[PDB]
Amino acid sequence: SPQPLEQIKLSESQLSGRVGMIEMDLASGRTLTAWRADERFPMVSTFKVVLCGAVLARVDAGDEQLERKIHYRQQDLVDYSPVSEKHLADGMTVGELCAAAITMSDNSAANLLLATVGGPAGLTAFLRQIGDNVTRLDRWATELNEALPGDARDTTTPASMAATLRKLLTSQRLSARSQRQLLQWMVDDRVAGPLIRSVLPAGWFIADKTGAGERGARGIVALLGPNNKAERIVVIYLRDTPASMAERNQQIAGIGAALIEHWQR
Ligand SMILES: OC[C@H]1O[C@H](O[C@H]2[C@H](O)[C@@H](O)[C@H](OCCCCCCC3CCCCC3)O[C@@H]2CO)[C@H](O)[C@@H](O)[C@@H]1O
Ligand SMILES: O=C/C=C/NCC(O)CC=O
């Protein structure tokens, strides 16, 4: 594999779309690679990690409990609810909802949680409160994946998302237990985690949240590192490409391969 930047460029050439990427040391925030880092990209399902960060902030303040059981109705369900559709009779706890939203990309679970933090506007205010003045959520679970060209709704930038994830996971804005919980939910991703591990060389740590939308939109926010350590935050977004999902996945994997083969920068 070529150098990371060379591979990112190759990916845009092959996909005919824009790639946005940041590679950052998790512990210090040192930026190693930045490509279209200040350009907007649809967050798609990656917004779910920030959502649960807001939920944990409420728990830390005593305004919420991960144990609290939420009962909902069938009419509350939206497209793709693998876990939440199984609990119309018994409900789900706030913590279970975050696990479902993050590890199974359950959209109804995400919407139920979004309601608890004041909706898209409330989540955006939370982002402003932790110093992210760029990321914005405007719509609910399914509609936010529309990815219309030039539409600023439901977007982030690679640099903003990386800084925000770092703040939630390590800045002590969240309590120690909450930072540990958010990390474990990412470690537990069932959608892409197992697959990524199956293709990673032995010794490489992975925690992640992925997402997909229209017009080729794709995204992944992840923690990656050798020696089984979450050394770096890697955020990659793709937008406006007509490529198959398989090729978009292969190109993201290719950027990962370049990182792995040239890690010591
Ligand atoms: O020299 C380094 C390594 O080179 C190869 O490893 C390959 C591996 O066989 C392949 O499967 C993977 O594909 C990349 C898989 C990446 C998957 C997702 C990455 C994510 C993670 C973070 C966010 C964005 C991308 O590349 C590596 C590096 O070339 C060798 O197989 C391995 O024995 C050796 O230790
Ligand atoms: O990103 C999180 C969930 C996204 N759901 C919609 C799609 O995956 C795109 C279908 O075209």
Query: What is the DSSP track for 94-138?
Result: HHHHHHHHHHS--HHHHHHHHHHTTHHHHHHHHHHHTT-SS-B--
In total, the chain counts a number of residues equal to 265
| Beta carbons of 47 and 137 less than 8 angstroms apart | yes
Beta strands in 164-204 (DSSP E): none
| Beta carbons of 35 and 252 less than 8 angstroms apart | no
Give CB contacts under 8 A, 24+ apart, made by 209-212. Answer: 209/45, 209/46, 209/48, 209/49, 209/102, 210/45, 210/46, 210/105, 211/43, 211/44, 211/45, 211/46, 211/47, 211/48, 211/105, 211/145, 212/44, 212/45, 212/145, 212/245
Provide the CA 86 distance to its chain's centre, in angstroms: 24
Q: Is 186 helix (H, G, I), strand (E, B) or coil?
A: helix
According to DSSP, the residues that pair with 238 across neighbouring strands are 19, 218
Ligand 2, residues at Cβ distance < 6 Å? 44-45, 105, 145, 211-214
**Cα(171) to centroid(ligand 2), Å:** 30
Question: Rounded CA gap, 156 and 51, in Å?
Answer: 13
Q: List C-alpha distances in Å: 196 to 2, 90, 201, 256.
A: 20, 33, 10, 10
According to DSSP, the residues that pair with 221 across neighbouring strands are 209, 235
Q: What angle do CA 217, 220, 222 make, to 5 degrees?
A: 170
Question: Rounded CA gap, 253 and 258, in Å?
Answer: 9
Beta strands in the chain (DSSP E): 18-25, 31-35, 41-42, 69-70, 92-93, 155-156, 205-212, 218-225, 232-239
Of the residues 67, 85, 143, 261, only one is catalytic, namely 143
Q: Going by CA atoms, what residue is nearest to atom 6 of ligand 2?
A: 213
Annotated catalytic residue 45: yes
Mutating to test ligand 1, I would choose from 191, 199, 220 the residue with most ligand atoms within 8 A of its C-beta, which is: 199
**Cα(110) to centroid(ligand 2), Å:** 13
Of the residues 45, 84, 105, 178, only one is catalytic, namely 45
Annotated catalytic residue 64: no
Domains of the chain: 1-265 (3.40.710.10)
Residue 246 burial (CB < 10 Å; 0-12/13-18/19+)? exposed
Q: List C-alpha distances in Å: 234 to 29, 182, 195, 238, 260.
A: 11, 16, 17, 13, 12
Q: Going by CA atoms, what residue is nearest to atom 35 of ligand 1?
A: 201
